[PDB]
Design a protein around this motif. Structure first.
Motif, PDB file in Angstrom:
ATOM      1  N   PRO A 159       0.797  -1.235   0.000  1.00 54.18           N
ATOM      2  CA  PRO A 159       0.000   0.000   0.000  1.00 54.18           C
ATOM      3  C   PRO A 159       0.821   1.274   0.000  1.00 54.18           C
ATOM      4  O   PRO A 159       0.313   2.320  -0.417  1.00 54.18           O
ATOM      5  CB  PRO A 159      -0.849  -0.147   1.270  1.00 54.18           C
ATOM      6  N   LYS A 160       2.078   1.232   0.431  1.00 52.03           N
ATOM      7  CA  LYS A 160       2.896   2.413   0.221  1.00 52.03           C
ATOM      8  C   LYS A 160       3.077   2.708  -1.261  1.00 52.03           C
ATOM      9  O   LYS A 160       3.293   3.866  -1.637  1.00 52.03           O
ATOM     10  CB  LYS A 160       4.246   2.267   0.906  1.00 52.03           C
ATOM     11  N   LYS A 161       2.944   1.704  -2.118  1.00 55.64           N
ATOM     12  CA  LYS A 161       3.050   1.980  -3.540  1.00 55.64           C
ATOM     13  C   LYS A 161       1.753   2.468  -4.151  1.00 55.64           C
ATOM     14  O   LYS A 161       1.771   2.972  -5.275  1.00 55.64           O
ATOM     15  CB  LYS A 161       3.539   0.748  -4.281  1.00 55.64           C
ATOM     16  N   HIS A 162       0.629   2.324  -3.465  1.00 57.10           N
ATOM     17  CA  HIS A 162      -0.558   3.011  -3.938  1.00 57.10           C
ATOM     18  C   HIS A 162      -0.559   4.472  -3.532  1.00 57.10           C
ATOM     19  O   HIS A 162      -1.204   5.288  -4.190  1.00 57.10           O
ATOM     20  CB  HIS A 162      -1.811   2.313  -3.435  1.00 57.10           C
ATOM     21  N   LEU A 163       0.118   4.825  -2.448  1.00 54.92           N
ATOM     22  CA  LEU A 163       0.374   6.237  -2.203  1.00 54.92           C
ATOM     23  C   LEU A 163       1.330   6.788  -3.242  1.00 54.92           C
ATOM     24  O   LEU A 163       1.001   7.731  -3.969  1.00 54.92           O
ATOM     25  CB  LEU A 163       0.950   6.446  -0.812  1.00 54.92           C
ATOM     26  N   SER A 164       2.516   6.189  -3.343  1.00 52.36           N
ATOM     27  CA  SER A 164       3.518   6.696  -4.271  1.00 52.36           C
ATOM     28  C   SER A 164       2.962   6.744  -5.681  1.00 52.36           C
ATOM     29  O   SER A 164       3.082   7.751  -6.385  1.00 52.36           O
ATOM     30  CB  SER A 164       4.756   5.810  -4.224  1.00 52.36           C
ATOM     31  N   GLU A 165       2.350   5.646  -6.101  1.00 44.54           N
ATOM     32  CA  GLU A 165       1.615   5.536  -7.348  1.00 44.54           C
ATOM     33  C   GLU A 165       0.545   6.603  -7.482  1.00 44.54           C
ATOM     34  O   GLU A 165       0.675   7.543  -8.269  1.00 44.54           O
ATOM     35  CB  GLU A 165       0.946   4.166  -7.409  1.00 44.54           C
ATOM     36  N   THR A 166      -0.506   6.458  -6.683  1.00 42.06           N
ATOM     37  CA  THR A 166      -1.749   7.168  -6.928  1.00 42.06           C
ATOM     38  C   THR A 166      -1.578   8.669  -6.794  1.00 42.06           C
ATOM     39  O   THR A 166      -2.293   9.429  -7.452  1.00 42.06           O
ATOM     40  CB  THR A 166      -2.821   6.655  -5.976  1.00 42.06           C
ATOM     41  N   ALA A 167      -0.633   9.119  -5.972  1.00 40.43           N
ATOM     42  CA  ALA A 167      -0.410  10.552  -5.857  1.00 40.43           C
ATOM     43  C   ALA A 167      -0.095  11.166  -7.205  1.00 40.43           C
ATOM     44  O   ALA A 167      -0.510  12.291  -7.500  1.00 40.43           O
ATOM     45  CB  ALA A 167       0.722  10.834  -4.882  1.00 40.43           C
ATOM     46  N   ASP A 168       0.624  10.437  -8.042  1.00 40.35           N
ATOM     47  CA  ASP A 168       1.070  10.949  -9.326  1.00 40.35           C
ATOM     48  C   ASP A 168      -0.087  11.389 -10.203  1.00 40.35           C
ATOM     49  O   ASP A 168      -0.265  12.588 -10.435  1.00 40.35           O
ATOM     50  CB  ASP A 168       1.891   9.880 -10.016  1.00 40.35           C
ATOM     51  N   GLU A 169      -0.901  10.435 -10.645  1.00 37.64           N
ATOM     52  CA  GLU A 169      -1.931  10.696 -11.640  1.00 37.64           C
ATOM     53  C   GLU A 169      -2.658  11.982 -11.290  1.00 37.64           C
ATOM     54  O   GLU A 169      -2.880  12.846 -12.146  1.00 37.64           O
ATOM     55  CB  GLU A 169      -2.907   9.523 -11.706  1.00 37.64           C
ATOM     56  N   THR A 170      -2.966  12.136 -10.006  1.00 34.23           N
ATOM     57  CA  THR A 170      -3.498  13.399  -9.530  1.00 34.23           C
ATOM     58  C   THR A 170      -2.532  14.538  -9.805  1.00 34.23           C
ATOM     59  O   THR A 170      -2.919  15.568 -10.366  1.00 34.23           O
ATOM     60  CB  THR A 170      -3.802  13.292  -8.048  1.00 34.23           C
ATOM     61  N   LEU A 171      -1.270  14.375  -9.420  1.00 32.44           N
ATOM     62  CA  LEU A 171      -0.296  15.431  -9.653  1.00 32.44           C
ATOM     63  C   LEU A 171      -0.256  15.868 -11.096  1.00 32.44           C
ATOM     64  O   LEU A 171      -0.690  16.969 -11.426  1.00 32.44           O
ATOM     65  CB  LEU A 171       1.104  14.990  -9.298  1.00 32.44           C
ATOM     66  N   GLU A 172       0.276  15.018 -11.968  1.00 25.79           N
ATOM     67  CA  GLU A 172       0.557  15.488 -13.315  1.00 25.79           C
ATOM     68  C   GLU A 172      -0.723  15.746 -14.087  1.00 25.79           C
ATOM     69  O   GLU A 172      -0.812  16.736 -14.819  1.00 25.79           O
ATOM     70  CB  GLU A 172       1.447  14.506 -14.061  1.00 25.79           C
ATOM     71  N   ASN A 173      -1.731  14.891 -13.930  1.00 21.35           N
ATOM     72  CA  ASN A 173      -2.978  15.166 -14.622  1.00 21.35           C
ATOM     73  C   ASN A 173      -3.535  16.510 -14.209  1.00 21.35           C
ATOM     74  O   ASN A 173      -4.080  17.241 -15.038  1.00 21.35           O
ATOM     75  CB  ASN A 173      -3.985  14.065 -14.353  1.00 21.35           C
ATOM     76  N   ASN A 174      -3.372  16.873 -12.948  1.00 19.84           N
ATOM     77  CA  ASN A 174      -3.831  18.178 -12.528  1.00 19.84           C
ATOM     78  C   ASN A 174      -2.890  19.293 -12.936  1.00 19.84           C
ATOM     79  O   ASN A 174      -3.324  20.439 -13.029  1.00 19.84           O
ATOM     80  CB  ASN A 174      -4.051  18.187 -11.029  1.00 19.84           C
ATOM     81  N   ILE A 175      -1.628  19.005 -13.212  1.00 18.51           N
ATOM     82  CA  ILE A 175      -0.773  20.102 -13.631  1.00 18.51           C
ATOM     83  C   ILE A 175      -0.984  20.410 -15.098  1.00 18.51           C
ATOM     84  O   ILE A 175      -1.066  21.576 -15.488  1.00 18.51           O
ATOM     85  CB  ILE A 175       0.694  19.800 -13.321  1.00 18.51           C
ATOM     86  N   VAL A 176      -1.081  19.385 -15.941  1.00 21.39           N
ATOM     87  CA  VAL A 176      -1.461  19.639 -17.323  1.00 21.39           C
ATOM     88  C   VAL A 176      -2.861  20.214 -17.375  1.00 21.39           C
ATOM     89  O   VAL A 176      -3.166  21.076 -18.205  1.00 21.39           O
ATOM     90  CB  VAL A 176      -1.351  18.359 -18.162  1.00 21.39           C
ATOM     91  N   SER A 177      -3.733  19.758 -16.481  1.00 21.76           N
ATOM     92  CA  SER A 177      -5.084  20.288 -16.460  1.00 21.76           C
ATOM     93  C   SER A 177      -5.081  21.767 -16.129  1.00 21.76           C
ATOM     94  O   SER A 177      -5.815  22.546 -16.739  1.00 21.76           O
ATOM     95  CB  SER A 177      -5.938  19.516 -15.465  1.00 21.76           C
ATOM     96  N   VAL A 178      -4.253  22.182 -15.176  1.00 23.70           N
ATOM     97  CA  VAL A 178      -4.174  23.603 -14.859  1.00 23.70           C
ATOM     98  C   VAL A 178      -3.552  24.368 -16.009  1.00 23.70           C
ATOM     99  O   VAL A 178      -4.107  25.360 -16.494  1.00 23.70           O
ATOM    100  CB  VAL A 178      -3.386  23.836 -13.568  1.00 23.70           C
ATOM    101  N   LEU A 179      -2.383  23.922 -16.455  1.00 24.31           N
ATOM    102  CA  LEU A 179      -1.634  24.684 -17.438  1.00 24.31           C
ATOM    103  C   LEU A 179      -2.431  24.860 -18.711  1.00 24.31           C
ATOM    104  O   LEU A 179      -2.458  25.948 -19.293  1.00 24.31           O
ATOM    105  CB  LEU A 179      -0.320  23.991 -17.746  1.00 24.31           C
TER     106      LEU A 179
END
Ligand code: ZN
Lengths: 257, 49, 105
Positions: A227-247
């Protein structure tokens, strides 16, 4: 649980005739088959001529109808009449009582026959307003009292889709495209709820992992994933998808305006 | 955007005959410029979100 | 003699609680709840508490009542952008640091 599947050609012929009749309401008939108690499939539609009076029982034209029937027979389109479309332009999707009586005139043909209301004008390039349902905003007319709503989906063959792809050629325009926002609302929500879900799993692995050896832990957890890899994992999609989404929006606003 | 600009130059200068079918489409490009329930704060609330 | 220093802290607490539980209070009442002699005593003590980043208030002198600062909407504006941004950066260099001391393997 009950549902209808509306083929593409049905839906397009639908919206075409509706948009064409504005600002008067048009009616026609629906060709398909009843799979089970839980399903109606509509593969075809044909359009019913105008009447001096509004859409009503006699608006259905026998001569016209069968005259169309056989001429579809020669094309192999043979199907039941499973329902009847209709349009309430500007008024949203509901049945007037006069809509109801006719709907009954289609009950005594077949008990499962359905009513489809299309609403040309306020159906727009965004969500299309469409409704299908059968008897016993809209609650003024007794949405649940005299009748009840149904659900709708769309059958798509592979080749069908493949034609539809080439409509828009997005190969040049990509990168200024902003994907549907509501969808990234379920995204940015369900993602967070999920991160919550696996938070305390990472909590349980740090406590249990604390007081129990790695050799013992592996025996337990190797089935599922770290489950530490679902944190490390899942945090990403939110991160980058939201950064391209913002930009992307930051660019569309200043560049396009 | 370059392309269209110097073209329009060629319309008022090179005297390439007026092509209405294009001008219509330019207009339709203006009609779609977002004015910018105001969309402005509709966007701000997102970017915050 | 450590403990007898607390007389400052105790009163700080008194003020902070009187603040969280009231939007605005006439000096009279604070001076009653804290047992003190005079209002003039109060606004020295409260004026002090404010400077220390405790209350986040202001004081209405002529009516003599403390008023505590509000949240003043503004979400629909860009201030949350700035704020979140600062918090973000300050999360980054935490991540950075924790990878710079990470080098050891
Ligand atoms: Zn109707």
């Amino acid at each position: 649980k009950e549902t209808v599947y509306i083929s593409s050609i049905a839906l397009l012929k639908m919206l075409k005739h509706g948009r064409a009749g504005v600002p008067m309401e048009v009616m026609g008939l629906m060709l398909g088959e009843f799979v089970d108690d839980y399903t109606v499939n509509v593969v075809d539609v044909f359009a019913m001529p105008q009447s001096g009076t509004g859409v009503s029982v006699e608006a259905v034209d026998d001569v016209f109808q069968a005259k169309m029937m056989d001429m579809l027979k020669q094309t192999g389109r043979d199907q039941m009449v499973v329902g009847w479309y209709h349009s309430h332009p500007g008024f949203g999707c509901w049945l007037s009582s006069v809509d109801v009586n006719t709907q009954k005139s289609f009950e005594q043909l077949n008990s499962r026959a359905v009513a489809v209301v299309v609403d040309p004008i306020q159906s727009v390039k965004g969500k299309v307003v469409i409704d299908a349902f059968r008897l016993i905003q809209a609650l003024i007319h007794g949405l649940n009292r005299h009748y009840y709503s149904l659900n709708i989906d769309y059958h798509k063959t592979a080749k069908e889709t493949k034609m539809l792809m080439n409509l828009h050629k997005e190969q040049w325009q990509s990168g200024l495209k902003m994907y549907d926002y509501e969808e990234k609302e379920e995204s940015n929500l369900a993602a967070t709820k999920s991160m919550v879900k696996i938070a305390e799993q990472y909590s349980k692995r740090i406590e249990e992992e604390k007081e129990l050896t790695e050799e013992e832990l592996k025996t337990r957890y190797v089935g599922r994933q770290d489950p530490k890899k679902h944190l490390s994992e899942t945090a990403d999609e939110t991160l980058e998808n939201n950064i391209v989404s913002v930009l992307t929006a930051g660019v569309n606003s200043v560049a396009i305006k | 955007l370059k392309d269209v600009v110097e073209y329009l130059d060629k319309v008022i200068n090179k005297e390439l005959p007026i092509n209405h079918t294009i001008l219509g489409k330019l207009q339709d490009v203006f009609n779609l410029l977002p004015n910018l329930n105001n969309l402005q704060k509709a966007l701000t609330v997102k970017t915050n979100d | 003699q450590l403990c007898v220093r607390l007389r400052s802290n105790v009163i700080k607490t008194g003020i902070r609680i009187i603040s969280l539980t009231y939007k605005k209070i006439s000096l009279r009442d604070i001076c009653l709840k804290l047992n003190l002699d005079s209002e003039q005593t109060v606004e020295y003590m409260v004026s002090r508490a404010i400077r220390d980043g405790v209350i986040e208030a202001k004081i209405n002198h002529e009516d003599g009542f403390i008023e505590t600062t509000e949240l003043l909407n503004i979400y629909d504006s860009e201030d949350p952008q700035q704020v979140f941004d600062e918090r973000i950066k300050f999360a980054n260099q935490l991540h950075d640091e924790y990878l710079v001391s990470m080098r050891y393997p």
